[model samples]
Target chain A: SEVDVKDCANHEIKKVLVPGCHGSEPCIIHRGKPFQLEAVFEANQNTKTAKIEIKASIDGLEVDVPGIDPNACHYMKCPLVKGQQYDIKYTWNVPKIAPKSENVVVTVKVMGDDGVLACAIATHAKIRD
Target chain B: SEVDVKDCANHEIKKVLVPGCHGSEPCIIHRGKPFQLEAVFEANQNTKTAKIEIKASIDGLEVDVPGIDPNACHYMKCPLVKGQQYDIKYTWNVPKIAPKSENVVVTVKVMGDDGVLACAIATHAKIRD
Candidate 1:
């Protein structure tokens, strides 16, 4: 579920295919002007040199942001066109190898600065059902 | 168009019936858990005692927040349930009398902390045409 992915504070995932609407339904078509798409990470505010990778995907298109600290939160925004359908995905690097693998994925749909669709999914890494 | 409403800085309009998707179509269904809904206001840093009112609406259900400054930016967040559709609208008071009036409306749909549908529309107040 979306909640599971958002609660990934430890960053113990390798890969995940998070489909919007549980990969069951398509998001609504939001038609409006675009606002900045920002991603914020909240860390301990004391830890430095955190290892993390943040990648964004929409409709299979991907872009990567850099220099994210796990100690504090980071924010970034990009222009989003109106009256178009988009799917945004976020993936992070797994910090430690757990007894069981873990991975996560999220979906973001832009309708405007005012309208948006954000969702995600998390599961064990390298585990195929 | 949606761009017209966001570009309004003078706040000359009041009472706008902003319909999401032009009041033409319904927003997509976002399914996810509960998160927070935040509203931010940006005003001049030097200006104090700026008169402004910030209100939020979803699916005709409205909740109004208070104490918004026109000088600096303000941010607030509220808990949002997942797997639900929301329509968020924002209405501000008209500052002065003008030849025409203005009003704006916005729609917000929550899909989790990650997925959401947000859109809005603006028009002159007291004008039904």
Candidate 2:
């Protein structure tokens, strides 16, 4: 479940709210990890089917991966090399015949693959007087 | 002093989160009401003197007000006309010799004069099946 990744980001046990901002912060760095994509989709009663598409890019370089079906949800693990940046793209569609038209809202959540919390920088780099 | 306006904007009694969407909502409209302007100011210890200025505009028409000193904090009550839009502008300054140099931060809070909450629209206009 994606909750595990969110819990790692909200690591209250280690008190590492900000990583890399302090010189002596003790934390584990995530090298090869997968994250949930954060997105929401809604379809009207007229919708019959659904589809979704996803893509990833790193440092402006697109990664080659197999195409995904637009109607199904799937899990993917990023193969990002160390010290390289990555970006993800997703496109989803709902056909006109989908059920549950009244409550046809889909929410997508993504976690960071690297398991690094964004707050670590500020904690490690406290301003010196 | 300004808490009254914030309470009005957050009108739990009226439940008018969105206005102009429903007809049967029991909400009092603010026709010729005044609202507080929200802003804050901070100065470093090295500052010698400060100045504050305020202005207002509505429907692209600028309403002229008295000039304000930059170094002092003051309260102002708006005199808005009925059925007219209004805008407010404010500026402030601080002198370097002012006391409490270590805590040279000033927070400005403004409340609404009209007792109309912003949340009433959605409840009154419940989406029908």
Candidate 3:
């Protein structure tokens, strides 16, 4: 499993949570099952635009998967304002057929329209049949 | 590198050749470059329709790649007849952003509209930067 949880230099991250992992435990995810991710971060400046992307990698084959829920703003409010704390929850899906490996890395990256370096997070996961 | 070269129960394989290998040498393929394959075999039955697919696997990410020439028949005669020896030449392409790996297995599979178990061939390739 792969998980890298952090924030950009300008932004502040309160915490990243995996509900299945129960906050800080390692995640054991079932193939073809869905999982949850929670990101609580604070905006340093007023921002109206940003993009979020998620990817799954296993046995060297990393693929761009479509969001299981499709809309990020639908999960939370958009056009984040300065000094505002935001909490967002995302539901993620996994492919049914994949190579066998104990290490599954999932990456989530966010880029702001404002001058901010792209920030990414990783989650290391064990897989079950 | 991965290379599996063989024939179906009915067909007789004369040989499988990678142009860069010079007749039975291990292949060193360059990323983002084109390669060639020559299959010399004898069809055991008349086939009106068939399908040929090519795939590349590196670091566990296996993807279906479109043929560079786009037409198998353009490279050889179609509706293969029984007892006819055929020599088919194919040009293949590689992706530039593949994970670094020495073992890049390229597989080619062919199935006839006629009753024939899907037969495949593999090429174990070493990648060059």
A68 Cα displacement, candidate 3 (Å): 32
Task: Provide the clash count, candidate 1.
Answer: 38
Model 3: per-residue Cα lDDT over B1-129, one tens digit each: 123464445446667777547533457776545565667777767886546666778766785553233234433456778788877654444444334577666655566666542355454567776
Give the alpha-carbon lDDT of every model.
0.26, 0.23, 0.57
lDDT of 2 by residue, A31-83 (tens): 11111122211211122222332333333344432213332212122232333
Cα RMSD for candidate 3? 18.3
Question: For candidate 2, lDDT tens digit of each residue in B7-126?
Answer: 222333221122232334422222111111232212212222223333333233443322132222112112323333322222111111112211111222222334221211111111
Query: For model 1, what TM-score does chain A reach?
Result: 0.24
**What is the TM-score of each predicted model, taking all chains together?**
0.19, 0.16, 0.43
lDDT of 1 by residue, B19-119 (tens): 33222333221211111122322221222122223344433445332212222111112232333222323222221111121232443221223322222
- What TM-score does each model's chain B reach against the true chain B? 0.23, 0.24, 0.74
- Model 1 lDDT at residue A74: 19
